[PDB]
């Protein structure tokens, strides 16, 4: 007596995957997306006459779940040739910028990274079972900064790795859970070069939006946008779903794939488990934002790290020419450090790194301000990883997915896909046993 067998909440990779699994089993399926677009924390846009990625975009064949889907839908990779860099810069907490030879810059980040992840084999022999070893559980008492303090790195090496880890945290490294970081490294074959190959090297042919829609089309599911879910209530036979318009939708089961930081917007009746409530109140620690700057000058192929007390923590050349100038792709760990949508504030901070540049224009997506992300990529705080089951657990007729709920590449498109396959299996169990 329901409108649908399955309602999937959220049109990111986790929801699109869950919808495709449910739809192909014959279940009448609906996907409700709060924004007026699909993709979630993946979003391809346009800036200065060129395509840009405001959110997630980069994949790799070491990421098993997204790669299998690419082969199901016959999508290849689109390589970002990483080239020989013209410039590598480090900006320290005090704001001083230093130019390093790219080969010595690369050597020192590898030393720091390999020292940071020296024990990945022992802690995560099975990276897709994060709590398999007691050492992983014990490490969940430490932050990343706890480890960095013991590694005896140089001032350069520490700034490099701390900027890198603050990026992965979307936060200062004293708050960043350490096992989450090692686990990702382990997922990449416990190997520096293999893991690095996954970071910003390959994109999906046809974009992330193509794969999401390839799955949703395959699913046959009904898709509705601009429909934020305000409450989910467990009532006889199914669940009852409240949009904003005081529209009411019935389903046998609901798959929630919303970002953890947005559970704040949704009333649950009855109340969810106390372990899950503790997670919703904690949230995830990323406060990242994405920004593109078009400068008049041709700066060539640049790369920069900026330490956590500075705003432009990750700078890369997206494209360059004497005609164009330079389009810089910038990721900001913490949106406290700058207002990416205030252009003069952006202009001063870019000039601190490349003095005397002229900014023609800027484009920014403040993920932490967006009510339907309120944060960026998944980043676990201290002690959160060892309780991941509490967030994964089904709650009666409510199932939970999303990249935060995956076991493997939790900071990635792939963890989102992984959670979608899990949710689809759980739907089948609930609806069919
Ligand atoms: C700046 C940034 C850069 C990134 N770069 C990479 C990369 O290079 N490589 C990689 O692998 N990963 C990257 N990621 C991470 C990747 O994008 C995410 O892990 C993945 O997209 C999350 O998928 P998801 O389905 O779990 O959540 P989401 O994509 O966030 O989808 C959840 C959906 O739920 C919607 N929603 C929220 N609340 C409601 C509500 N009340 N009602 C209805 N709908 C709601 C949201 O609008 C959203 O569409 C990046 C993330 C960010 C923020």
Neighbouring-strand partners of residue 289: 332
- Shortest-distance atom of ligand 1 to CA 377: 51
Cα separation of 308 and 312, whole Å?
9
By most ligand atoms within 8 Å of CB, the mutation choice from 170, 226, 258 for ligand 1 is 258
Q: In this structure, is the dihedral angle defined by the CA atoms of residues 128, 131, 135 and 136, taken in order, positive or negative? A: positive
Output the CA 12–ligand 1 centroid distance in Å.
6
**Do residues 275 and 387 lie in contact, with contact meaning Cβ atoms separated by under 8 Å?**
yes
Closest-CA residue, ligand 1 atom 9, reads: 58
- Shortest-distance atom of ligand 1 to CA 416: 26
> Residue 259: CB within 6 Å of ligand 1?
yes
> Residue 332: CB within 6 Å of ligand 1?
no
Cα separation of 25 and 6, whole Å?
11
Neighbouring-strand partners of residue 327: 294, 319
> Residue 12: CB within 6 Å of ligand 1?
yes
Unique residue bearing structure tokens 């395959």: 218
How many Cβ atoms sit within 10 Å of the Cβ of residue 245? Answer: 10
Q: Is residue 155 a known part of a binding site? A: no
CA contacts within 13 A on the Cβ side of 101? 3
Strands (DSSP E) contained in 164-213 are: 202-204
CB burial of residue 154 (10 Å; 0-12, 13-18, 19+): exposed
The helix or strand, by DSSP H or E, that contains position 16, with its residue range, turns out to be helix 13-24
Strands (DSSP E) contained in 163-221 are: 202-204
Residues 6+ apart with CB under 8 A from 134: none
The data reach a resolution, in angstroms, of: 2.2
The helix or strand, by DSSP H or E, that contains position 58, with its residue range, turns out to be strand 58-59
Residues 6+ apart with CB under 8 A from 84: 102, 301
Domains (range + CATH), the chain: 1-80+199-283+378-433 (3.50.50.60), 81-198+284-377 (no CATH)
- Shortest-distance atom of ligand 1 to CA 405: 26
Cα distances (Å, whole numbers) of residue 277 to 274, 380, 407: 5, 16, 20
Cα separation of 338 and 351, whole Å?
14
* C-alpha distance across the termini of the chain, in Å: 19
Output the CA 276–ligand 1 centroid distance in Å.
20
Experimental method: X-ray
Output the CA 98–ligand 1 centroid distance in Å.
34
Cα separation of 303 and 322, whole Å?
18
The helix or strand, by DSSP H or E, that contains position 422, with its residue range, turns out to be helix 413-432
Q: 25: which DSSP letter?
A: T
Closest-CA residue, ligand 1 atom 6, reads: 56
Output the CA 283–ligand 1 centroid distance in Å.
14
By most ligand atoms within 8 Å of CB, the mutation choice from 45, 55, 268, 391 for ligand 1 is 55
Helix, strand and coil percent figures for the chain, each rounded to 5 = 35, 25, 40
The helix or strand, by DSSP H or E, that contains position 114, with its residue range, turns out to be helix 102-116
């Amino acid at each position: 007596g329901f409108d649908y067998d399955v309602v999937v909440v959220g049109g990111g990779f986790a929801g699109a995957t869950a919808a495709r699994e449910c739809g192909l089993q014959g279940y009448r399926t609906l996907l409700l997306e709060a924004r007026s677009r699909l993709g979630g924390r993946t979003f391809t846009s346009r800036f200065a006459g060129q395509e840009i990625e405001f959110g997630g975009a980069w994949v790799h064949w070491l990421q098993p779940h997204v790669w299998a889907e690419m082969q199901r839908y016959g999508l290849g990779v689109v390589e970002d040739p990483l080239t020989n860099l013209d410039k590598t810069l480090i900006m320290y907490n005090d704001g001083s910028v230093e130019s390093i030879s790219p080969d010595e810059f690369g050597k020192n980040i590898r030393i720091a990274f390999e020292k940071l992840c020296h024990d990945a084999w022992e802690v995560f022999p099975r990276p897709h079972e994060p709590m398999f070893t007691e050492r992983a559980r014990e490490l969940d008492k430490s932050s990343v900064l706890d480890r960095i303090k013991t590694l005896g790195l140089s001032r350069l090496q520490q700034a490099q790795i701390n900027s890198y880890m603050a990026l992965y945290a979307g936060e200062t490294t004293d708050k960043f859970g350490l096992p989450g970081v090692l686990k990702l490294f382990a997922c990449g074959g416990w190997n520096y070069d293999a893991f690095m190959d996954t970071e910003t090297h390959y994109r999906i042919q046809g974009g992330t939006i193509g794969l999401i829609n390839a799955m949703l089309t395959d699913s046959g599911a009904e898709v509705r946008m601009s429909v934020p879910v305000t409450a989910v209530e467990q009532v006889n036979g199914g669940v009852k779903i409240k949009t904003d318009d005081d529209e009411i939708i019935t389903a046998g089961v609901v798959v929630m794939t919303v970002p953890l930081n947005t559970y704040k917007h949704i009333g649950f009746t009855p109340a969810l488990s106390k372990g899950k409530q503790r997670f919703i109140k904690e949230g995830q620690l990323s406060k990242g934002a994405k920004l593109y700057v078009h400068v008049k000058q041709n700066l060539g192929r640049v790369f920069a790290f900026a330490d956590e007390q500075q705003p432009l923590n990750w700078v890369q050349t997206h494209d360059y020419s004497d005609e164009l100038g330079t389009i810089l792709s910038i990721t900001i760990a913490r949106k406290e450090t700058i207002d990416v949508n205030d252009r003069d504030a952006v202009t001063r901070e870019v000039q601190k790194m490349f003095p005397g540049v002229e900014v023609l224009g800027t484009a920014a997506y403040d993920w932490t301000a967006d009510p339907f992300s309120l944060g960026a990529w998944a980043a676990y705080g201290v002690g959160q990883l060892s309780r991941l089951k509490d967030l994964q657990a089904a709650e009666g007729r409510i199932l939970f997915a999303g990249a935060e709920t995956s076991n493997g590449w939790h900071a990635n498109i792939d963890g989102a896909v992984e959670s979608g396959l899990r949710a689809g299996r759980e739907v089948k169990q609930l609806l069919s046993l």
